[PDB]
Write a protein that binds this ligand. Sequence first.
Ligand code: HEM
Ligand code: HEM
Ligand SMILES: CNCc1cccc(-c2cc(C)cc(N)n2)c1
Ligand SMILES: CNCc1cccc(-c2cc(C)cc(N)n2)c1
Ligand SMILES: C[C@H](O)[C@H](O)[C@H]1CNc2nc(N)[nH]c(=O)c2N1
Ligand SMILES: C[C@H](O)[C@H](O)[C@H]1CNc2nc(N)[nH]c(=O)c2N1
Ligand SMILES: [Zn+2]
Lengths: 418, 414
Amino acid sequence: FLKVKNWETEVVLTDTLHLKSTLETGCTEYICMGSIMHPSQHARRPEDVATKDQLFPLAKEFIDQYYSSIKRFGSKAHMERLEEVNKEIDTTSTYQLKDTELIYGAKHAWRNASRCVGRIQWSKLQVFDARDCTTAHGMFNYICNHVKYATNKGNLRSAITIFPQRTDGKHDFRVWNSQLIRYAGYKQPDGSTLGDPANVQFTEICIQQGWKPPRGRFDVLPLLLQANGNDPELFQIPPELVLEVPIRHPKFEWFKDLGLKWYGLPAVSNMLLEIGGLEFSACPFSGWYMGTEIGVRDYCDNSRYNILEEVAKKMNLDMRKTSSLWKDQALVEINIAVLYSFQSDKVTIVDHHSATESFIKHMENEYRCRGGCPADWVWIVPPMSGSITPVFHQEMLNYRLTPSFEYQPDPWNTHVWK
Amino acid sequence: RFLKVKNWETEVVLTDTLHLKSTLETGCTEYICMGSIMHPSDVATKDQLFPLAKEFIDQYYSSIKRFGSKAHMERLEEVNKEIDTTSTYQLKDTELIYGAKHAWRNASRCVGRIQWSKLQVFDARDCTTAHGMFNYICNHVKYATNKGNLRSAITIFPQRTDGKHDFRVWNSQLIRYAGYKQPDGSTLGDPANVQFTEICIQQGWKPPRGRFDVLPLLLQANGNDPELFQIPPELVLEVPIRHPKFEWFKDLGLKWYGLPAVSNMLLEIGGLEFSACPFSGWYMGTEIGVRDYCDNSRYNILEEVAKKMNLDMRKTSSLWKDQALVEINIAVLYSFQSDKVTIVDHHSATESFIKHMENEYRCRGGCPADWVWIVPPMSGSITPVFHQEMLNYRLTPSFEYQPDPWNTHVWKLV
Ligand code: HEM
Ligand code: HEM
Ligand SMILES: CNCc1cccc(-c2cc(C)cc(N)n2)c1
Ligand SMILES: CNCc1cccc(-c2cc(C)cc(N)n2)c1
Ligand SMILES: C[C@H](O)[C@H](O)[C@H]1CNc2nc(N)[nH]c(=O)c2N1
Ligand SMILES: C[C@H](O)[C@H](O)[C@H]1CNc2nc(N)[nH]c(=O)c2N1
Ligand SMILES: [Zn+2]
């Protein structure tokens, strides 16, 4: 038993789910790594094609969990499934998931994502099975359909598209983009950066692959898609599938003249989805934005669009010294405008007040039915106004449950070109 | 072994070797992280005390470039003699100063540690009565306050002996405001202090029953019942809160005290436990403007400020709370600066902490830091500490939590 307390409400929750955790957190009895971005390299199967004694135990554990979930365990179909997975590994060194197991696995990987404040939605996830894909052209078709379904004319819907699992490690499917939709970044001759500085390296790869850059501040990047280990290929997402929101402010009429915009669909495409020892290296997933992601991090991080100085000037703030809080003051106005703009255009978005409140309710739900909820305080607390949200005052336990979403190397560090 | 921490804004990478010197638990295990748990959870024997004392004396003599010296070996022998004959020992004044400074240096939740080596240590180990403690604390407040040019200080009372004769300051800080629950369920003053205010009233304090009554000192010497004392009002420096642009702000009637002075923690040096050790620095603005004023369970002023600001309070997505929070914190900094009372804003403070952290990795091999506490409670990611990976571990000497004394004290009168 482990208790967590909320210091605002004095609610105490009791955690037993942590007894099912599989991987190391990175912490020990003597050192806490809770603010390390990648604290652990502990993996459930070695790098390349596992032996039978390595894969089968992980498969059995997942199948046991799935059949437990549906009030079976030991049933006819469970034992036959075990035997089927046994023969499949014996004869191919891997196995294939049933459609139901795949959906269960994807939803539970989201459910287990301790860094995600959005998980009250976890069981309402649309799963697109793309395991029949064979070429980068087919990957583009599956991704276009995902983007169109998920955008839904602004009434955003959570979705995941799952490409063929890893086999030997030389035939990986990868989306090289970090998100399906991001803006290019360009190193300028004088030394500054145009567009998104985070994407300068990826933009250079695209240009080096023949992309013709319009060289603006908000150029939607092409897709760079890799199927079955082959060299990646460039595709332009049809712009009518890319919903964008011009940013304006409900009081500052000059705000629109800053020429800011963002895209509506946050779609992570560089993570790995691990189910029963199987590794799905291409599994783009998408939901909808919390405003602080755009307003605080994308726009105001020093190494991103870094717009605080420009907004503060227009606001006529005292920028001589930090103690005028001119940065904090512009920061609020920017986040007001982001929310106001998405809402004006009827594009789904949630503010950090509503999102964090939903997550406290999700925590309570999970402790009641599941006996726990893994949660990473460092990621869950929003990057502005921390303590006036309820999650700031909520103790959380962090542990690693499977199925899960994991980080993986960027493909340009590992891909041997042809 | 080595551990690396990266800053994701600057890509600077630092290498921690100092974590190898910890030997106290964090509360985390290899499969669970408890990094957001507030408190992750009676006197040492001779055998327990020997190695704790040795480790501390060894690190003192190493710090002063005399490890292995004749003075080092004789001090070790002398300490062992005391433990053997008295079951405890006494620190030299130099060791006490060194221990107190390093407890601060090791405080993983404190963002102000760039200042750690400039700490004025008042030795109060000869004190025997609550009247004596009051005198020592008055002198601490006056020295630390310094007419608004604040100076860090700590006053250290006699160490624990058998656990039945503890010195304790029952206040959680030296200066705080009273809280009174009303019959209708409202609270007047600071709701955090309702319980301690009740104890004071029960002990004979006559409260003014206003919004900002400075509480009396409740002081316990040698395990006796605690005794009430009024800090002389001319030693309690306060700042009335006004705003540089909203002339109505002063009409909220807000004020705060200038000296933050924690008095309920325990200072452990070489196995010795100093249960009464009040220490003081100066404020970071968000402590007052964000937590004291805008926590829902504290003075909770967001509503009244936003109303006078004429904000739309119907929807959360108007971010009226966020907008009013910023203005309150502007007022707090402007007020202190105008009255020439030392204060630091969260931007300046976090920037200095990054510089201190880098220096500590260079000269010491690391810097234990609690990201959950170091990142300020507003505007988190526009400060540099948000982007800084940190390792948290427990080094000694250290400041430790201890039970509230009213939960363990057994009373003697009537
Ligand atoms: C439905 C609305 C959703 C909201 C509002 C939401 C909110 C968030 C936010 C604010 C973050 C932090 C992002 C960052 O700082 O980079 C995050 C992270 C994450 N989300 Fe969610 N999310 C949603 C849906 C989803 C879905 C559908 C999935 C997967 C099926 C998912 C899986 C994750 C994962 C794995 C992370 C961690 C990313 C990392 O470690 O880099 N989320 N989410
Ligand atoms: C000199 C200026 C100082 C500044 C600006 C400063 C800043 C801070 C802040 C903002 C906190 C967090 C407070 C909270 O959120 O409750 C803190 C905590 C702390 N400070 Fe410092 N501090 C200073 C001096 C000191 C000194 C002189 C000591 C001891 C000698 C000290 C030891 C601590 C400890 C032990 C904590 C953790 C308290 C807890 O866990 O409740 N600090 N400091
Ligand atoms: C490496 N950062 C991960 C990352 C970066 C950018 C956006 C997200 C995100 C993802 C989803 C599904 C919903 C949401 N509101 N935001 C996640
Ligand atoms: C329960 N938190 C402890 C606490 C509560 C209130 C204030 C502080 C503090 C202490 C010092 C020395 C400097 C500073 N700026 N603030 C610490
Ligand atoms: C060092 C620190 O862990 C890092 O900056 C983290 C802090 N918390 C975060 N929280 C979220 N949601 N997203 C992030 O990218 C980060 N970055
Ligand atoms: C639950 C959580 O650990 C708790 O609210 C912490 C968060 N970080 C904090 N950080 C500081 N400086 N002070 C605090 O009181 C807290 N409270
Ligand atoms: Zn930890």
